[PDB]
A paper describes a structure:
K. pneumoniae use type 1 pili tipped with the two-domain FimH adhesin to cause urinary tract infections (UTIs). FimH interdomain interactions result in a conformational equilibrium between low-affinity and high-affinity forms. While the FimHLD binding pocket mediates direct stereospecific recognition of mannose, the interaction of the lectin domain with the pilin domain greatly influences the conformation of the mannose-binding pocket of FimH.
We investigated the structure of the mannose-binding FimH lectin domain truncate (FimHLD) of K. pneumoniae, which is separated from any allosteric effects of the FimH pilin domain. We solved the X-ray crystal structure of TOP52 FimHLD bound to d-mannose to 1.34 Å. A comparison of the structures of UPEC and K. pneumoniae FimHLDs revealed that both FimHs bind d-mannose in a similar fashion with small differences in the orientation of Y48 and Y137, located on binding loops 2 and 3 respectively, which make up a “tyrosine gate” and are involved in binding of mannose ligands. In K. pneumoniae FimHLD, Y48 and Y137 are ~4.2 Å closer to each other compared to UPEC FimHLD. We show that the K. pneumoniae FimHLD isolated away from the pilin domain primarily adopts a high-affinity mannose-binding conformation, supporting that interactions between the lectin and pilin domains negatively impact the mannose-binding pocket. Close examination of the crystal structure showed two residue interaction differences at positions 132 and 141 from UPEC at the base of binding loop 3, between the K. pneumoniae residues (H132 and S141) compared to the analogous interaction in UPEC (R132 and D141). We found that only the K. pneumoniae FimHLD H132R/S141D double mutant significantly enhanced binding, reflected by an increase in melting temperature by 2.8 °C for the FimHLD in complex with the high-affinity mannoside Fim1033 (36). These results suggest that the H132/S141 residues in K. pneumoniae FimHLD result in a less flexible binding loop 3 that reduces mannose-binding affinity.
Author numbering: 1 to 163
Amino acid sequence: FACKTATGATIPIGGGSANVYVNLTPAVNVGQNLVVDLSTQIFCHNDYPETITDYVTLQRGSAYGGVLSSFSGTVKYNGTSYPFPTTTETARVIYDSRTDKPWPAVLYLTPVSTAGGVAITAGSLIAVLILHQTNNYNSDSFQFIWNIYANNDVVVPTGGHHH
Ligand SMILES: OC[C@H]1O[C@H](O)[C@@H](O)[C@@H](O)[C@@H]1O
Protein backbone atom coordinates (compact mmCIF):
# COMPACT_ATOMS: atom_id res chain seq x y z
CA PHE A 1 0.00 0.00 0.00
CA ALA A 2 1.30 3.37 -0.96
CA CYS A 3 0.00 6.78 -1.91
CA LYS A 4 0.74 9.73 -4.14
CA THR A 5 -0.50 13.20 -4.92
CA ALA A 6 -1.78 14.34 -8.29
CA THR A 7 1.39 16.46 -8.62
CA GLY A 8 3.60 13.43 -7.98
CA ALA A 9 4.63 13.50 -4.33
CA THR A 10 4.76 9.92 -3.06
CA ILE A 11 4.64 8.17 0.28
CA PRO A 12 5.95 4.59 0.07
CA ILE A 13 5.12 1.30 1.72
CA GLY A 14 5.37 1.80 5.46
CA GLY A 15 4.16 5.37 5.54
CA GLY A 16 5.85 8.69 5.63
CA SER A 17 4.86 12.24 4.84
CA ALA A 18 4.19 14.43 1.86
CA ASN A 19 3.01 17.93 1.06
CA VAL A 20 -0.25 18.70 -0.76
CA TYR A 21 -0.84 22.20 -2.11
CA VAL A 22 -4.48 23.15 -2.57
CA ASN A 23 -6.33 25.92 -4.35
CA LEU A 24 -8.92 27.58 -2.14
CA THR A 25 -11.83 29.80 -3.04
CA PRO A 26 -10.27 33.27 -2.64
CA ALA A 27 -13.21 34.81 -0.76
CA VAL A 28 -15.20 32.71 1.67
CA ASN A 29 -18.18 34.70 2.75
CA VAL A 30 -19.51 34.64 6.30
CA GLY A 31 -21.37 31.43 7.15
CA GLN A 32 -20.16 29.74 3.97
CA ASN A 33 -18.15 26.55 3.66
CA LEU A 34 -14.68 26.52 2.15
CA VAL A 35 -14.43 23.02 0.69
CA VAL A 36 -11.02 21.38 0.40
CA ASP A 37 -11.61 18.19 -1.61
CA LEU A 38 -8.50 16.10 -1.18
CA SER A 39 -10.01 13.23 -3.17
CA THR A 40 -8.83 14.96 -6.35
CA GLN A 41 -5.27 15.24 -5.07
CA ILE A 42 -4.47 12.17 -2.92
CA PHE A 43 -4.59 8.66 -4.36
CA CYS A 44 -3.58 5.30 -2.98
CA HIS A 45 -3.31 1.71 -4.11
CA ASN A 46 -3.01 -1.81 -2.76
CA ASP A 47 0.15 -3.65 -3.79
CA TYR A 48 -1.14 -7.21 -3.44
CA PRO A 49 -4.92 -7.13 -3.82
CA GLU A 50 -5.24 -10.80 -4.79
CA THR A 51 -4.13 -11.75 -1.28
CA ILE A 52 -4.41 -8.65 0.94
CA THR A 53 -7.24 -6.21 1.61
CA ASP A 54 -6.09 -2.80 2.83
CA TYR A 55 -8.13 -0.79 5.32
CA VAL A 56 -7.66 2.96 5.39
CA THR A 57 -8.94 5.48 7.90
CA LEU A 58 -8.42 9.09 8.79
CA GLN A 59 -6.72 8.65 12.15
CA ARG A 60 -6.17 12.27 13.13
CA GLY A 61 -6.53 15.68 11.60
CA SER A 62 -5.05 18.89 12.94
CA ALA A 63 -5.65 22.50 11.95
CA TYR A 64 -2.98 25.13 11.41
CA GLY A 65 -2.43 28.70 10.35
CA GLY A 66 -5.50 30.61 9.35
CA VAL A 67 -7.71 27.55 9.60
CA LEU A 68 -6.70 26.99 13.20
CA SER A 69 -7.23 30.62 14.10
CA SER A 70 -10.27 31.62 12.03
CA PHE A 71 -12.30 28.57 10.91
CA SER A 72 -14.36 25.75 12.40
CA GLY A 73 -15.55 22.70 10.62
CA THR A 74 -15.68 19.07 9.72
CA VAL A 75 -14.10 16.46 7.52
CA LYS A 76 -16.28 14.30 5.30
CA TYR A 77 -14.56 10.94 5.02
CA ASN A 78 -16.13 8.44 2.65
CA GLY A 79 -19.42 10.26 2.99
CA THR A 80 -19.59 10.55 6.79
CA SER A 81 -18.93 13.81 8.60
CA TYR A 82 -16.50 13.92 11.50
CA PRO A 83 -15.22 16.83 13.57
CA PHE A 84 -12.18 18.68 12.32
CA PRO A 85 -9.74 18.83 14.06
CA THR A 86 -10.21 15.09 14.44
CA THR A 87 -8.84 13.11 17.38
CA THR A 88 -10.94 9.95 16.91
CA GLU A 89 -10.28 7.59 14.03
CA THR A 90 -12.92 7.37 11.32
CA ALA A 91 -14.54 4.34 9.79
CA ARG A 92 -12.48 2.57 7.17
CA VAL A 93 -12.31 2.53 3.38
CA ILE A 94 -11.24 -0.62 1.57
CA TYR A 95 -8.45 -0.49 -1.01
CA ASP A 96 -8.46 -3.64 -3.10
CA SER A 97 -6.82 -2.79 -6.43
CA ARG A 98 -3.39 -1.90 -7.78
CA THR A 99 -5.05 1.01 -9.58
CA ASP A 100 -4.83 4.39 -7.89
CA LYS A 101 -8.06 5.24 -6.06
CA PRO A 102 -8.87 8.61 -4.48
CA TRP A 103 -8.65 9.07 -0.74
CA PRO A 104 -12.20 10.29 0.02
CA ALA A 105 -11.43 13.12 2.46
CA VAL A 106 -13.03 16.56 2.11
CA LEU A 107 -12.63 19.45 4.58
CA TYR A 108 -15.63 21.73 5.11
CA LEU A 109 -14.51 24.84 6.94
CA THR A 110 -16.60 27.88 7.86
CA PRO A 111 -15.19 31.17 9.18
CA VAL A 112 -15.78 31.80 12.87
CA SER A 113 -17.87 34.81 13.90
CA THR A 114 -14.83 36.98 14.65
CA ALA A 115 -13.23 36.32 11.27
CA GLY A 116 -12.92 39.16 8.79
CA GLY A 117 -10.16 40.16 6.42
CA VAL A 118 -7.31 37.92 5.36
CA ALA A 119 -7.92 34.56 7.04
CA ILE A 120 -5.47 32.25 5.24
CA THR A 121 -2.20 33.32 3.62
CA ALA A 122 -0.73 31.70 0.54
CA GLY A 123 1.92 29.13 1.33
CA SER A 124 0.74 28.54 4.89
CA LEU A 125 0.23 25.14 6.40
CA ILE A 126 -3.51 24.82 7.07
CA ALA A 127 -4.02 21.16 7.94
CA VAL A 128 -2.31 17.88 8.64
CA LEU A 129 -4.24 14.67 7.99
CA ILE A 130 -3.03 11.23 9.08
CA LEU A 131 -4.14 8.41 6.81
CA HIS A 132 -3.86 5.14 8.73
CA GLN A 133 -3.47 1.93 6.77
CA THR A 134 -3.84 -1.59 8.12
CA ASN A 135 -4.81 -4.81 6.36
CA ASN A 136 -6.19 -8.32 6.83
CA TYR A 137 -2.81 -9.99 6.34
CA ASN A 138 -0.26 -8.99 8.99
CA SER A 139 0.26 -6.54 11.84
CA ASP A 140 1.13 -3.59 9.63
CA SER A 141 -0.15 -0.26 10.88
CA PHE A 142 1.23 2.68 8.95
CA GLN A 143 0.73 6.42 8.92
CA PHE A 144 0.68 8.50 5.75
CA ILE A 145 0.93 12.10 6.88
CA TRP A 146 -0.42 14.72 4.47
CA ASN A 147 0.63 18.31 5.10
CA ILE A 148 -1.96 20.56 3.45
CA TYR A 149 -0.72 23.97 2.31
CA ALA A 150 -2.72 26.81 0.82
CA ASN A 151 -1.80 27.85 -2.71
CA ASN A 152 -3.53 31.20 -2.32
CA ASP A 153 -4.82 33.66 0.24
CA VAL A 154 -8.41 33.38 1.45
CA VAL A 155 -10.27 36.48 2.61
CA VAL A 156 -13.48 36.71 4.62
CA PRO A 157 -15.02 39.90 3.22
CA THR A 158 -15.96 42.64 5.65
CA GLY A 159 -18.35 45.54 5.54
CA GLY A 160 -17.89 48.87 7.20
CA HIS A 161 -16.87 52.09 5.50
CA HIS A 162 -13.33 51.01 4.53
CA HIS A 163 -12.87 49.25 1.17
O1 LIG B 1 -1.08 -3.22 -0.15
C1 LIG B 1 -0.89 -4.56 0.26
C2 LIG B 1 0.23 -4.62 1.24
O2 LIG B 1 1.44 -4.13 0.59
C3 LIG B 1 2.60 -4.20 1.39
O3 LIG B 1 2.94 -5.53 1.80
C4 LIG B 1 2.45 -3.38 2.67
O4 LIG B 1 2.25 -2.00 2.31
C5 LIG B 1 1.21 -3.83 3.40
O5 LIG B 1 1.00 -3.03 4.56
C6 LIG B 1 -0.02 -3.79 2.51
O6 LIG B 1 -1.11 -4.30 3.22
